Amino acid sequence: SVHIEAKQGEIAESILLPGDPLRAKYIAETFLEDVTCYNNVRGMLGFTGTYKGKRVSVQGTGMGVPSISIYVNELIQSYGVKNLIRVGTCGAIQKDVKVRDVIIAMTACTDSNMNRLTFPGFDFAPAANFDLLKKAYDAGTEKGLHVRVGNVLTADVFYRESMDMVKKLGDYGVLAVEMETTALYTLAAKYGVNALSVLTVSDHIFQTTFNEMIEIALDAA
Amino acid sequence: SVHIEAKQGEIAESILLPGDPLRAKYIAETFLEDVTCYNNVRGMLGFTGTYKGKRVSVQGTGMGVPSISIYVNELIQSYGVKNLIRVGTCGAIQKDVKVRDVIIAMTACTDSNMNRLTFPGFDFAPAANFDLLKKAYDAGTEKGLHVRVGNVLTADVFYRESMDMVKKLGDYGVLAVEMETTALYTLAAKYGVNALSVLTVSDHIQTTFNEMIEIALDAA
Amino acid sequence: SVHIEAKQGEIAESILLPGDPLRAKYIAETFLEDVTCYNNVRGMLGFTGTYKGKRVSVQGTGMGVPSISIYVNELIQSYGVKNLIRVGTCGAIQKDVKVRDVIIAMTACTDSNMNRLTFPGFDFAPAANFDLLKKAYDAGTEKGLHVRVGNVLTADVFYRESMDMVKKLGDYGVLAVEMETTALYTLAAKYGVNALSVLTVSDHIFQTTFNEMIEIALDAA
Amino acid sequence: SVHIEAKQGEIAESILLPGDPLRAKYIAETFLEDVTCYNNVRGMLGFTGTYKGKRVSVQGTGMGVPSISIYVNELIQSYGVKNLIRVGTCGAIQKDVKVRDVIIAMTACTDSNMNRLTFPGFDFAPAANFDLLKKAYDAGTEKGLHVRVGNVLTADVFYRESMDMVKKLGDYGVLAVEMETTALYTLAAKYGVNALSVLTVSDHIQTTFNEMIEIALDAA
Amino acid sequence: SVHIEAKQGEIAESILLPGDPLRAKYIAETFLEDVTCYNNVRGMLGFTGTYKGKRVSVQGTGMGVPSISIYVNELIQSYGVKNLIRVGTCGAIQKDVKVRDVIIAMTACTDSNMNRLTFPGFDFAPAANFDLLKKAYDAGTEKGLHVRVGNVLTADVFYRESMDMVKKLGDYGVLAVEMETTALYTLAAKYGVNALSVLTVSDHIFQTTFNEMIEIALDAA
Amino acid sequence: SVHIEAKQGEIAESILLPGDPLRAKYIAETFLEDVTCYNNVRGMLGFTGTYKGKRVSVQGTGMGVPSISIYVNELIQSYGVKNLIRVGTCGAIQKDVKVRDVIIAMTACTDSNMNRLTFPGFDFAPAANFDLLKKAYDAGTEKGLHVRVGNVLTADVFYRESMDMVKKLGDYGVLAVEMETTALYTLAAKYGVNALSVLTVSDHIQTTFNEMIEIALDAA
Ligand SMILES: Nc1ncnc2c1ncn2[C@@H]1O[C@H](CO)[C@@H](O)[C@H]1O
Ligand SMILES: Nc1ncnc2c1ncn2[C@@H]1O[C@H](CO)[C@@H](O)[C@H]1O
Ligand SMILES: Nc1ncnc2c1ncn2[C@@H]1O[C@H](CO)[C@@H](O)[C@H]1O
Ligand SMILES: Nc1ncnc2c1ncn2[C@@H]1O[C@H](CO)[C@@H](O)[C@H]1O
Ligand SMILES: Nc1ncnc2c1ncn2[C@@H]1O[C@H](CO)[C@@H](O)[C@H]1O
Ligand SMILES: Nc1ncnc2c1ncn2[C@@H]1O[C@H](CO)[C@@H](O)[C@H]1O
């Protein structure tokens, strides 16, 4: 495809989607066997390997709705991928969400215009695939992780002049801020494939755990 | 409160929210014991009774975001309600959603402006309380119902000049159309209380209904 | 129709539209003769009777644009209704509007998205039928009521976090807040039929009279 | 004021507002006595004279919301004007509206952003002063004119790539298109003064004009 | 055309566009020879004359996007005009822009809805014709003027309740406020013709020079 | 900074901003001397070296408004960068724009919400720094390149369901589509620093690239 140089058939139907291509490399090296690197276009590393007997891929997405949209569109439309699990980080809005918590996004709010353009006059709520969500939730519960299932903000702007609306979203139970989920969920829905975002809380607005999170994402995917 | 004539303490912390006040009456009569009617203001019947030893209420909401918003605000702010489960109907958008399926809304899209006003420049995605959602899903699964968990459209307009965008939403996996969930989920989130919508597919764009009420009561 | 169980021909061409179905019952019982109840679907009572020799109906609408839109669409499209007069309550924004004043809405502002969806990029101003408006105004004047003709806000939200914009609308002469008029006026205009809203001021944001208001609405309709 | 060179007190409390400054000249010459021209800034002629014993002014506004907004703001805030009646032309959308009909705008739709900026998230419906509207309607009726009271479109764009939405507005009873009323009505409402627009249908998408000026003067 | 009474062929392919029709008269009288007045419809004076051997026209536009849009549409579509240079005034937002500075607008921000209607969901940035811009910039530089090339605000509202957003735009380098440029640039782009706005700073939000500015606009056009 | 591991002073005041970090590497290797790599966080390579006696940096931005916004904010606010020149690719909308043409963006349209959030109710037109634009234009002209100065679309979506609006923008003279300029120009304006985007037409909806880098370095 335009941004992925990997053949037909080189990418597995199940794929993990870290924002950071170097985390894709870390995931492939740490968890996968029989690994090949299928992409280095724009340094956006993608790998395919085997995890407990199943082929799985792991592909960097870059940061932000537009970047992940490129890779997700190409993965689905050009490579026939069917299960896509973002594995990322996020920033907690509120005090009850703690660093190293694992957040599974049921849905995502956004300041992106991507869905207003597609559905003028409507608020589109991007939804996780429930089957994948349940699978990841159960795996995370079994793993002994602090797993929170809920709402996140998919932000276009990492640096905001005022965090007032972010705080307000926190008051309406939005757990954390990140920069990809709206796109992943919307595009997965568009193409009738299955998506989920599993996030580690790395900071506040106001690794051993990461490995466990990758494990539950691998298990789900 | 303005639209509910109940005395303090007469409404249970767990409440079912049918759109139709006559369905509230049906639910109270069919499933509850030790029933009292606590509201007849605007004919919007509300009841409290006991289900398997727990006090539970059931309150009509009327149709549409503005109507349910009134009742949900009053229930939360004036009556200290904590768990709110809409029990409603919806119209399937897609072929794979069948009449009498039970839909549990994870989230809701909307053509309402309610959230654009509150969060200018943002798309707010109203989210179900996951704990309640899981509880209802597990109950419905155990019950042997066809339960679908997914996205719904909360519509302001029942009669649309064109259903092009509704069809498009169906193409993006939106399961069905109804007229309340956005408001219920948003206001519950605002006040830090727990909400869920459990819906019977009644049309396309009863025995089933009883089983759905049962799982809503159980989750509630 | 979907929400009205009344036959063909059971609903009169002129109809009053209280938000409260129990007010429909009150109106039918108090003012009409030869009354039949043609609807109890969802408890949304509708009646037809005779007032000074003319058949007239009275139908609850419920609260809010979406609720009244349902009934108005069905009344016009399924029952051939031609003159629709909402008879409601409203909350005064400003000090110069007094409790028990009768407001006749020339037009309505709104926070609803209903018209932005229909006319993207435009502000649609829903307008009363002038003939009905004049008729009601003259009847109210003759009756000795305090009648104010002007602008109202049709609100989606009864409970607002901040009343700042409502106050601002009051500063621009918007008289009162209610929750139906935009829909009634827009749909009446769509179908080329005649609508009006006559409102009693019941509260501030910051019965003998009701009967007189029903009388002028009956006279107009 | 910035765009009007009149001294304090030179402008009457009642004023007619044609879009065309040459029509202001025509109105002053044709109908008024004891006339003075109080403004020629930007050629936007303004006059004050006497009509049946009352001082009245007549001021060109130019075309479009931004142009009329300038003059109306200055007239209200700098000159203490209280009654403002636009006397203009418009283009009929619908077949049932005929050339030379007089339209009295009860309200106006618009494609302008002026009110979305002031009231974010709201549709503001600019409303005529009912007292003035009734006065003009009664005068026009008495005059034997075809007078239509209803909705108009205040357009930012005279030349539109597609008139689909204009046609749609006509389907919702919008009578005619013009380019000022939204601004006049909104600003009059802002400042608690009285405004009306009385329009002659000149096209579809004089003797009549004189009679319309007469009813505007009478209402004014 | 509807608003211009001048024949076919009476208007030159190059035209200056002052907002004030009396400035059109001043420009024609002061700079042009062999002058004819081709329009007095609505007092919106338009002239054609000769400047250094070339026919050029000068046409008032009135104030505001809607007014200039009328004249620009008619000039392009009915009279085949190809080079359009607005010559106007503007109000400086910020302290570093001085009275009597000449501003050449590269682009314009706006509170107008004109472009949101044309390109729903998009921000359209109206752009000057670079060739004309360069020509005017070089002429202004040669003339010894203080010429600033940059961004302006095309306002619908001259009188704003709050100047907060205008100040904010000034903080983002927007130089001055005026009321025509968005329309001129957008319509010129629509029809594939060449436009520029050259503005004299006449005021702050918070003639010898004018003649020199007209001279550079004449030279460019 | 959060996404750049450079020590204070390691990044030059003048910087080139390719979307592709591997192009940053190519630029540093091909054109610069005394090169150090100051960043590998997220593989988003950044280098500083010397070009004709001046320190200059080159930093990958990634694709899309949100990605470039992160880097540009950090470069300006944490590293005191003053002159920022995006060196990118774009897709021609129109027939008259040819592959390998160099486009210098005077401004950018966008489907991003970034500026609607900052300036509600306004269309913000992000503008290049004219001084830099002129410098690059003159360099490109001198170089014998086909240089077009004009409007571009900064897109959030590379893959669009319909390219109708993109075609329409091309009809209004928008030259090409790319995915960063709106952000770069807006943030540079916010912080009072100087930005420009110089783009190679790579597709429709190298030797050329080297010459373009050269003019960007010269302007920088
Ligand atoms: N506080 C935060 N705000 C926005 N994105 C964040 C935050 N913390 C982590 N992220 C994630 O990391 C990247 C931005 O640093 C994005 O891909 C985003 O998903
Ligand atoms: N097809 C449908 N469209 C909209 N609402 C529906 C539909 N079917 C059932 N409903 C539900 O029933 C009521 C409208 O008839 C609303 O309360 C709504 O939730
Ligand atoms: N203050 C108020 N705000 C909104 N709606 C009101 C108010 N007072 C009366 N109403 C009317 O009564 C109902 C809400 O109580 C709606 O149908 C509405 O029209
Ligand atoms: N068809 C029309 N479209 C828009 N404005 C019109 C029309 N006919 C007359 N007008 C009025 O005349 C001027 C535009 O020619 C404006 O002041 C406007 O109010
Ligand atoms: N401060 C200002 N605000 C808006 N427009 C201005 C200003 N100064 C001059 N103008 C220009 O002059 C007219 C408004 O007085 C408009 O045509 C506009 O372009
Ligand atoms: N046709 C195109 N559409 C969008 N972006 C493009 C195109 N061609 C090149 N680009 C640029 O390349 C990247 C997307 O491939 C973005 O960084 C963008 O600026």
- CA C84 – ligand 4 centroid, Å: 33
- CA F99 – ligand 6 centroid, Å: 13
- Which of E90, E100, E184 has most ligand 5 atoms within 8 Å of its beta carbon, as the pocket-test mutant? E90
Which residues from chain D sit within 8 angstroms of residue C192, using beta carbons? 173
Cα gap C172→C107, rounded to integer Å: 13
Chains B and F touch (3+ CB pairs under 8 A): yes
Burial C27-60 (b: 16+ CB within 10 A, else e): bbeebbeebeebbeebbbbbbbbebeeeebbbbb
* Amino acid letter, E30: T
Burial of F103 (0-12, 13-18, 19+ CB in 10 A): buried
Which residues from chain F sit within 8 angstroms of residue E190, using beta carbons? 171-172
CA-closest candidate to residue A59, choices A73, A72, A69: A72
The CATH code of the domain at E1-221 is: 3.40.50.1580
Cα gap A24→A30, rounded to integer Å: 10
Is beta strand E176-178 parallel, antiparallel or unpaired with respect to E147-154? parallel
Resolution for the entry shown, Å: 1.7
Contact C150, D127 (CB under 8 A): yes
Q: If DSSP states are collapsed to H, E and C, what string results for chain A?
A: CCCCCCCCCCCCCEEEECCCHHHHHHHHHHHCEEEEEEECHHHCCEEEEEECCEEEEEECCCCCHHHHHHHHHHHHHHHCCCEEEEEEEEEECCCCCCCCCEEEEEEEEECCCHHHHHCCCCECCCECCHHHHHHHHHHHHHHCCCEEEEEEEECCCCCCCCCHHHHHHHHCCCCEEECCHHHHHHHHHHHCCEEEEEEEEEEECCCHHHHHHHHHHHHHC
* Residue whose pair of structure tokens reads 């007095």 in the numeric block: E40
Domain spans in chain D, listed from the N-terminal domain onward: 1-220
CA-closest candidate to residue F204, choices F172, F171, F167: F167
Contact A156, F65 (CB under 8 A): yes
Contact C107, C125 (CB under 8 A): yes
Q: Is E97 helix (H, G, I), strand (E, B) or coil?
A: coil
The DSSP code for E32 is -
Residues 6 or more apart from A173 whose CB is under 8 A from it? A150, A151, B127, B189, B192
What are the beta bridge partners of residue D203?
Answer: D91
Alpha carbon C86 to chain centroid distance?
2
Verify whether residue B203 is a known catalytic residue: yes
Which residues from chain C sit within 8 angstroms of residue B204, using beta carbons? none
Ligand 2 in reach of B179 Cβ (< 6 A): yes
Give the closest of A115, A122, A189 to B111, CB-based: A122
What's the token pair of residue D51? Answer: 């009509």
Alpha helices in E32-163 (DSSP H): 65-79, 114-118, 130-143
Cα gap D1→F201, rounded to integer Å: 52
CA-closest candidate to residue E206, choices E97, E89, E45, E72: E97
The verdict on domain D1-220 having CATH code 3.40.50.1580 is yes
Of the CA atoms within 13 Å of residue B4, those in its CB half-sphere come to: 30
Cα gap D194→C215, rounded to integer Å: 30
* Residue of chain F whose Cα is closest to the Cα of B120: F117
Residues 6 or more apart from A146 whose CB is under 8 A from it? A98, A100, A101, A102
Cα gap D30→D44, rounded to integer Å: 18
Nearest alpha carbon, ligand 2 atom 18: B178
- CA E180 – ligand 5 centroid, Å: 9
The pair phi, psi for residue D150, each rounded to 5°, is 180, -155
What's the token pair of residue A145? Answer: 């992780």
Ligand 6 in reach of F63 Cβ (< 6 A): yes
* Amino acid letter, F44: M
Burial of A55 (0-12, 13-18, 19+ CB in 10 A): middle
The pair phi, psi for residue A186, each rounded to 5°, is -70, -45
Residues 6 or more apart from D175 whose CB is under 8 A from it? D90, D92, D93, D94, D97, D103, D148, D150, D151, D152
Out of E156, E171, E203, E219, the active site residue is E203
Cα gap E118→C120, rounded to integer Å: 11
What are the beta bridge partners of residue D55?
Answer: D50
- Which of E59, E160, E177 has most ligand 5 atoms within 8 Å of its beta carbon, as the pocket-test mutant? E177
Cα gap B189→B121, rounded to integer Å: 19
Contact A177, A93 (CB under 8 A): yes
User: Which chains form contacts with chain B, at 3 or more CB pairs under 8 Å?
Assistant: A, C, D, F
CA-closest candidate to residue D47, choices D26, D64, D72, D73: D26
Q: Which of D109, D118, D123, D178 to mutate to test the interface with C (most CBs of C within 10 A)?
A: D123
Residue length of chain A: 221
- CA C154 – ligand 3 centroid, Å: 9
Ligand 2 atom closest to the CA of B88, numbered from 1: 19
Cα gap D87→D89, rounded to integer Å: 7
Please name the helix (run of DSSP H) or strand (run of DSSP E) that holds residue E165, with its range, or none. Answer: helix E164-171
Contact D126, D107 (CB under 8 A): yes
Ligand 4 in reach of D166 Cβ (< 6 A): no
Q: How far is C117 from chain E (nearest CA, A)?
A: 13
CB contact (8 A) between residue E22 and residue D45: no
What's the token pair of residue D40? Answer: 């020629």
Cα gap E94→E97, rounded to integer Å: 6
The pair phi, psi for residue F14, each rounded to 5°, is -105, 135
- CA F203 – ligand 6 centroid, Å: 9
Cα gap A77→E95, rounded to integer Å: 54
Residues 6 or more apart from E53 whose CB is under 8 A from it? none
Please name the helix (run of DSSP H) or strand (run of DSSP E) that holds residue F47, with its range, or none. Answer: strand F46-51
Going through chain C in order, the beta strands assigned E by DSSP cover: 14-17, 33-39, 46-51, 54-59, 83-92, 102-110, 147-154, 176-178, 194-204
F window 109-138, beta carbon within 8 A of B: 113, 116-117, 120
Of the CA atoms within 13 Å of residue D15, those in its CB half-sphere come to: 32
Q: Would you tell me how many other CB atoms lie within 10 Å of the CB of residue E151?
A: 28
The pair phi, psi for residue C172, each rounded to 5°, is -105, 25
CA-closest candidate to residue F19, choices F10, F11, F27: F27
Cα gap D127→D47, rounded to integer Å: 27
E window 20-49, beta carbon within 8 A of C: none
Give the closest of E106, E122, E172 to F109, CB-based: E122
Chains D and C touch (3+ CB pairs under 8 A): yes
Measure the CA angle with vertex D197, ends D192 and D198; round to 5°. Answer: 145
Nearest alpha carbon, ligand 1 atom 17: A63
Cα gap C42→C40, rounded to integer Å: 6
Burial of C192 (0-12, 13-18, 19+ CB in 10 A): exposed
* Residue of chain F whose Cα is closest to the Cα of B119: F117
Which residues from chain B sit within 8 angstroms of residue C114, using beta carbons? 156-157
- CA F156 – ligand 6 centroid, Å: 10
Ligand 3 in reach of C206 Cβ (< 6 A): no
Contact D152, D170 (CB under 8 A): no
F window 157-186, beta carbon within 8 A of E: 165, 168-169, 171-173, 182, 186
Of the CA atoms within 13 Å of residue A49, those in its CB half-sphere come to: 22
Angle between helices B207-219 and B130-143 (to 10 degrees): 140
Nearest alpha carbon, ligand 2 atom 19: B178
Residues 6 or more apart from E44 whose CB is under 8 A from it? D43, E3, E4, E21, E59, E60, E61, E62, E71
CA distances to A193, B72, D18, E71 from D60, rounded to whole Å, are: 62, 53, 5, 18
Nearest alpha carbon, ligand 2 atom 17: B63
Ligand 5 in reach of E60 Cβ (< 6 A): no
Cα gap E169→C149, rounded to integer Å: 41
| DSSP code per residue over F161-220 | S--HHHHHHHHTT--EEESSHHHHHHHHHHTT-EEEEEEEEEEE--HHHHHHHHHHHHH-
Burial F39-53 (b: 16+ CB within 10 A, else e): beebbbbbbbbebee
Ligand 4 atom closest to the CA of D91, numbered from 1: 1
CB contact (8 A) between residue C111 and residue B118: no
